[PDB]
Design a protein around this nucleic acid. Structure first.
Lengths: 403, 246, 124, 49, 61, 147
DNA sequence: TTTTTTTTTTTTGAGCGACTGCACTACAACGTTGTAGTGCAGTCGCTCTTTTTT
């Protein structure tokens, strides 16, 4: 669905397919590149007419669509009408992930029937195929969809010893289960800091300074920008709104004022391109190699103030700040715009004002955004109300698939 | 509704003001304002203008009207002018005066014009437009366009030979003949052969002296294309194209 | 007047012919060779601004709209579909003139497209 | 006492010709509008005439 | 000579059209190369069209 | 320069290549010979067409006099038996329908030989004629100078 | 209240009037046959001015 997820899919399948032993004819059939759903169907800026709309289907044998949670209903219907009568489609994504961008929920309403299980004949088929004991699902409502689904529960990067997976399992349960998960011993992974008044805001800014300590240490020591980006990609703040005291531009302006107060970052008031500002792009640009949601660090290597970006290929690219089409300060990212990325130490900041954005799926995506360490800055009543209030979307798929 | 006005709207408003009964006294105010009128270029006169000038300065004493014009130059009928208004004015007035002397051209060209236009009677086919033989100037009687051979005559009618010809072929052949004459006048003019002689004084013919008189844009482009083929640059004075269309 | 003049834009560039050249590239080349040299070799595409909105309703049909109407009418008459349904579809969008003149235009375009379809589907 | 002179009058003339074609050629039936279309294609030809 | 003049006439008719039909020479891709159609480039275009466009009219029926 | 843009100007040598080309007025919009008012005849009456063509010919004669009276030293004319009619060889030419042929042929229809005899009849020291020669030897010489 | 992305053009003159060829009947010379005038049909040239006012 997005170009950044396409780049991550390309680098992941590139580093994955070279490991497995292949042949000279098998290396020729390696998938070349991953395309956007607007680029695969041939979407135009002016008109909504596709190149493979209804008449000529895409000449494909197998189509692997990654991250189907960000696929809305109209994009799914436009993808369906483009497929021929012989192509095999494999959808990827998480069931409990965040909902789609526009109106609709395709992957959630599809994978809601994955909890029922397989069929009685399909269980014996999978036991004959895999050679192991595959459990069977009780009852039969839609055998095709329940057979086509699968559920992944065994996570390899984190187990029951880590509190991140236990918090993600307790998010789908009641809020008291999440309070118990955070409460006892914290699993040495999740910390809870109460944010009510201005002194808690100063303590949160001090803990963000302690989180961005290695980044500022590598920035002030005038080191290589690759280690600077690698230290910046370890700690990240996640906010809900955009403006106000609780948002993107509010936390960004407060962090800039705090770096102006304490001797951490020297900033000229009229230059707007001081050394050490983090920027992010808002529009895609395939000519420069940067996608939407990519971070860059502006610094002086000796030839002038240039912004270094970390490419997924392992290299670093130094671009002129005049060559950037869009640039916004990214000291704190939104949870919707931080999807696809991964951070080692995440810190969620929730606003005190009651908002329909903070719900169960938002906290689940904030929990799964962290690799190892996660911090929280919210009230107890907001965290109790966000878990119970699930973002349900009323759709006719529950009745159409049942008959 | 918008309160705007136009160029002919001023004439229409003045004709409607003089059309009323009180506006005649306003015309007397004009007789109080200027008790004389000298109207130049009377061939380019709308009927509203002549109706106004007849409303003001028809037969009142102490006021004079002097219509200085030329019926042989009324070429703006596409714009709104009309020679029948001039014929009505000539039928209305009583006295006529004419200028005999011509101070511009050589006497050879003057004699050619007085010979071509006085072949038959009433060459302009109207009774109220008479042609008179003009007289050349005494100071310009020594103007001679001389070639390498001898003195070139004034008018040279290049008769294209043939029984019947089309439009594009005739235009192309006459454009090629004109370009050949231009390059012959410019090639011999830079060596001191073709000259313009006033008495004993001589001047070589440059590219700015020869001018091609056309009527339409297509034949002007034809002349320019037939002249730029022989390495002769030419300008178009009637070019009204916008700079924003390049 | 001591400056160098404008040199020619045409210069011999190094180019190696690849192994797999698709048919679409040859079609885009032989549709317009100078345009394929400009917009594909040096990637220079002269992007002109879009046309402004006209001030009045279309009384006549000429240009791209007439060509698209004729193309859709020829694709409809090649399957012997109802021409009146496509007439109502084009009248509901306001692309046709109002009243009888749109009917006359649709009748003459249907006559021309039927005369073309009588030759097209004769050997299909 | 004060008025605004306009240089181009073709726009208001074309607008009045379009208004005349709207108030005259729209309510005609088919048997008259066929002859009107045979005489002129639109108001532009009438204005050019 | 008559065919050599009619081919030049057809080339000047198709390159620069009339005042009602847009000619082939009125294009943003051809005005960048040359501003005025020189006879040398005209003969080059003629030679390239004789080299390439000949099987168009050779196998036409 | 066009004939309307040459009114009141001055030129040493003037070439008129297309002074014999004429155009016939089709619409019937004339002026009455008694009331001197603009009469527009919506019906295709031949009298209105003739009365409009007479005014068109008078306008062409006035344009001819304007274009002729702008030369100072030398003027050159392009004469040809131009036929506006679609017939190629009909035995008569339409030069009498133009402004120049009305003075050359004295307002009478003639042939190409009649036009040539009418041209050769008015031969003086100032008025001469020559045939149109198609031929080119060399374009020009630049003769540039240093700055 | 939040958020996704996209680079491909295309079309366009038609009625007026002649040139040329084929077909069909009228009429006179040698029932039949050759020449002339007229009608129908396909093809092609052509052509659509000028300008300035506070």
């Amino acid at each position: 669905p997005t170009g950044k997820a396409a780049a991550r899919l390309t680098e992941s399948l590139g580093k994955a397919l070279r490991q497995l032993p292949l042949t000279d004819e098998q290396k020729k059939r390696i998938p070349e590149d991953a395309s956007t759903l607007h680029r695969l169907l041939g979407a135009q800026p002016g008109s909504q007419r596709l190149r493979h709309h209804a008449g000529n289907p895409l000449h494909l044998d197998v189509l692997v669509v990654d991250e189907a949670s960000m696929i809305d209903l109209p994009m799914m219907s436009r993808l369906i009408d483009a497929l021929p009568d012989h192509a095999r489609v494999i959808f990827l994504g998480d069931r409990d992930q965040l909902a789609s961008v526009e109106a609709g929920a395709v992957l959630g309403d599809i994978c809601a029937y994955a909890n029922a299980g397989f069929t009685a004949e399909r269980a014996r088929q999978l036991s004959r195929l895999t050679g192991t004991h595959v459990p069977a699902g009780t009852g039969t409502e839609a055998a095709s969809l329940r057979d086509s689904l699968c559920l992944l529960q065994k996570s390899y990067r984190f187990g029951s010893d880590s509190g991140i997976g236990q918090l993600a399992a307790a998010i789908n349960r009641g809020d008291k289960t999440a309070v118990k998960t955070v409460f006892q011993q914290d699993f040495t992974d999740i910390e809870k800091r109460l944010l009510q008044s201005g002194e808690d805001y100063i303590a949160m800014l001090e803990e963000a300074l302690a989180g961005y300590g290695r980044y500022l240490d590598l920035l002030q020591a005038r080191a290589e920008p690759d280690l600077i980006i690698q230290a910046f990609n370890e700690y990240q703040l996640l906010c809900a709104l955009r403006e106000g005291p609780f948002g993107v531009a509010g936390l960004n302006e407060r962090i800039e004022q705090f770096m102006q107060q304490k001797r951490k970052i020297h900033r000229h008031p009229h230059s707007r391109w001081y050394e050490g500002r983090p920027v992010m792009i808002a529009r895609n640009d395939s000519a420069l190699g940067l996608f939407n949601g990519d971070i860059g660090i502006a610094l002086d290597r000796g030839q002038g103030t240039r912004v270094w970006f970390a490419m997924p290929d392992g290299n670093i690219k130094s671009v002129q700040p005049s060559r950037l089409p869009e640039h916004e300060t990214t000291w704190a990212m939104t949870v919707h715009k931080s999807q696809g990325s991964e951070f080692d130490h995440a810190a969620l900041i929730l606003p005190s004002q009651r908002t329909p954005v903070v719900t169960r799926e938002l906290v689940y995506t904030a929990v799964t955004r962290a690799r190892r360490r996660l911090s929280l800055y919210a009230d107890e009543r907001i965290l109790s109300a966000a878990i119970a209030t699930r973002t349900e979307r009323r759709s006719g798929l529950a009745a159409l698939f049942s008959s | 509704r918008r309160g705007e006005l136009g160029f002919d709207d001023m004439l229409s408003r003045l004709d409607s003001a003089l059309r009323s009964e009180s506006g005649e006294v306003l015309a007397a105010a004009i007789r109080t304002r200027f008790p004389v009128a000298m109207i130049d270029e009377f061939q380019d006169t709308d009927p509203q203008q002549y109706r106004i000038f007849r409303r003001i300065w028809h037969h009142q004493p102490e006021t004079a009207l002097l219509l200085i014009g030329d019926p042989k130059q009324a070429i703006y009928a596409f714009r709104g002018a009309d020679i029948f208004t001039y014929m009505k004015a000539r039928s209305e007035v009583h006295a006529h005066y004419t200028l005999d002397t011509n101070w511009r051209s050589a006497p050879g060209m003057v004699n050619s014009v007085n010979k071509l236009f006085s072949q038959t009677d009433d060459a302009f086919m109207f009774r109220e437009i008479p042609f008179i033989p003009v007289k050349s100037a005494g100071k310009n009687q020594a103007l001679r366009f001389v070639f390498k051979g001898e003195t070139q005559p004034a008018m040279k009618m290049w008769l294209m030979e043939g029984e019947s010809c089309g439009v594009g072929d005739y235009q192309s052949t006459m454009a090629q003949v004109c370009a050949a004459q231009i390059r012959d006048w410019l090639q011999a003019g830079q060596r001191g052969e073709a000259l313009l002689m006033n008495g004993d004084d001589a001047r070589p013919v440059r590219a700015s002296d020869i001018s091609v008189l056309v009527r339409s844009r297509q034949e002007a482009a034809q002349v320019r294309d037939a002249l730029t083929l022989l390495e002769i640059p030419s300008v178009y004075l009637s070019n009204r194209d916008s700079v924003f269309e390049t | 007047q001591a400056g160098k003049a404008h040199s020619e834009f045409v210069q011999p560039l190094p180019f190696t012919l690849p192994e797999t050249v698709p048919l679409e590239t040859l079609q885009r080349f032989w549709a317009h060779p100078v345009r394929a040299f400009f917009q594909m070799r040096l990637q220079v595409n002269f992007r002109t601004e879009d046309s402004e909105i006209p001030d009045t309703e279309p009384f006549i049909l000429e240009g791209l709209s007439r060509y698209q109407i004729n193309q859709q009418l020829l694709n409809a008459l090649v399957e012997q579909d109802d021409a009146e349904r496509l007439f109502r579809r084009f009248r509901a969008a306001g692309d046709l003139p109002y009243g009888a003149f749109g009917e006359i235009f649709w009748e003459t375009q249907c006559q021309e497209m039927q005369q073309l379809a009588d030759r097209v589907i004769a050997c299909r | 006492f004060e008025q605004q002179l306009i240089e181009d009058e073709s726009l208001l003339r074309y607008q009045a010709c379009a208004d005349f074609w709207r108030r005259h050629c729209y309510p005609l039936p088919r048997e008259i509008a066929q002859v009107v279309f045979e005489t002129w294609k639109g108001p532009q030809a009438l204005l050019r005439d | 000579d008559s065919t050599l003049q009619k081919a030049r006439t057809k080339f000047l008719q198709a390159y620069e059209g009339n005042m009602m039909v847009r000619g082939e020479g009125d294009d943003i891709w051809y005005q960048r190369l040359w501003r005025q159609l020189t006879p040398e480039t005209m003969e080059a275009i003629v030679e390239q069209s004789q080299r390439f466009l000949l099987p168009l009219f050779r196998f036409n029926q | 320069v066009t004939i309307h843009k040459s009114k009141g100007l001055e030129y040493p040598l003037v070439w008129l290549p297309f002074i014999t080309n004429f155009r016939v007025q089709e619409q019937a919009f004339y002026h009455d010979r008694h009331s001197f008012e603009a009469v527009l005849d919506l019906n295709a009456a031949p009298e209105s067409v003739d009365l409009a063509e007479a005014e068109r010919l008078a306008e062409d004669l006035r344009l001819l006099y304007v274009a002729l009276t702008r030369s100072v030293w030398h003027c050159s004319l392009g004469v040809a038996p131009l036929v506006r009619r679609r017939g190629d060889k009909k035995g008569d030419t339409d030069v009498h329908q133009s402004a120049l042929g009305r003075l050359l042929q004295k307002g009478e229809p003639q042939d190409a030989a009649g036009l040539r005899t009418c041209i050769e009849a008015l031969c003086d020291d100032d008025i001469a004629w020559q045939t149109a020669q198609t031929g080119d030897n060399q374009p020009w010489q630049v003769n540039d100078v240093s700055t």
